[PDB]
Amino acid sequence: SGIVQQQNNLLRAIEAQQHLLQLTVWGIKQLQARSGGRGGWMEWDREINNYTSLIHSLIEESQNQQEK
Amino acid sequence: SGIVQQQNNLLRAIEAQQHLLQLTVWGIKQLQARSGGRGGWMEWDREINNYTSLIHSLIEESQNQQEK
Amino acid sequence: SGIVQQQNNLLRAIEAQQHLLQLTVWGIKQLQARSGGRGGWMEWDREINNYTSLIHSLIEESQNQQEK
């Protein structure tokens, strides 16, 4: 036990930052789509989903797990 | 009270990460501008500003509020 | 001493987020390369390397420095 608001203000930033990134990925994807299909990036897309999924879960296990 | 350097090293990362993102958003924006105007993304731009603004403020309220 | 798992779950997010960003930067770079060379962005590239390098090091000094 020690310092919790600073930990919640930091977590609240990561989350917001997570949203920011998802907007960029979208902006990037759409620009790619401009050429013709984004079939060459499955591994890029899958890589994105992989980490985003790990982060969302990392955030959720951090919010519901700290109440002391 | 407990562990502060690790909290400052993490905050210092979010901040730096904030800068990284703003460079990407710029890189993305300019590439969009290449076609012809970015008038269709106001909501995208506004969404960006919205979170970036929440994060900057979240960071500042975290720096000046922890001195114990 | 106080709260460590929440600090490790947050650090684990920044790291994963670091990877996410590096994928976006790549996606952005390649799209730029499409036109013809990315020689005008050295300062953009150098700016990226600069912060990414500060973040990696900030993360590493945070992992090996907290064992209490």
Curated annotation (Swiss-Prot), chains A, B, C:
Q: What is the lineage of its organism?
A: Viruses, Riboviria, Pararnavirae, Artverviricota, Revtraviricetes
Look up the domain of life of the source. Viruses
What stretch of the complete protein does the chain hold? Answer: 546 to 655 of 856
Query: What is its biological role?
Result: Acts as a class I viral fusion protein. Under the current model, the protein has at least 3 conformational states: pre-fusion native state, pre-hairpin intermediate state, and post-fusion hairpin state. During fusion of viral and target intracellular membranes, the coiled coil regions (heptad repeats) assume a trimer-of-hairpins structure, positioning the fusion peptide in close proximity to the C-terminal region of the ectodomain. The formation of this structure appears to drive apposition and subsequent fusion of viral and target cell membranes.
Q: Which organism is it from?
A: Human immunodeficiency virus type 1 group M subtype B (isolate HXB2)
How does this polypeptide assemble, per the annotation? The mature envelope protein (Env) consists of a homotrimer of non-covalently associated gp120-gp41 heterodimers. The resulting complex protrudes from the virus surface as a spike. There seems to be as few as 10 spikes on the average virion.
From the Swiss-Prot or TrEMBL record, give the protein name.
Transmembrane protein gp41
Ranges in coiled-coil conformation: 46-68
Q: Where in the cell is it found?
A: Virion membrane; Host cell membrane; Host endosome membrane
Residues with attached carbohydrate: N50
The way this protein sits in the membrane is described as:
Single-pass type I membrane protein
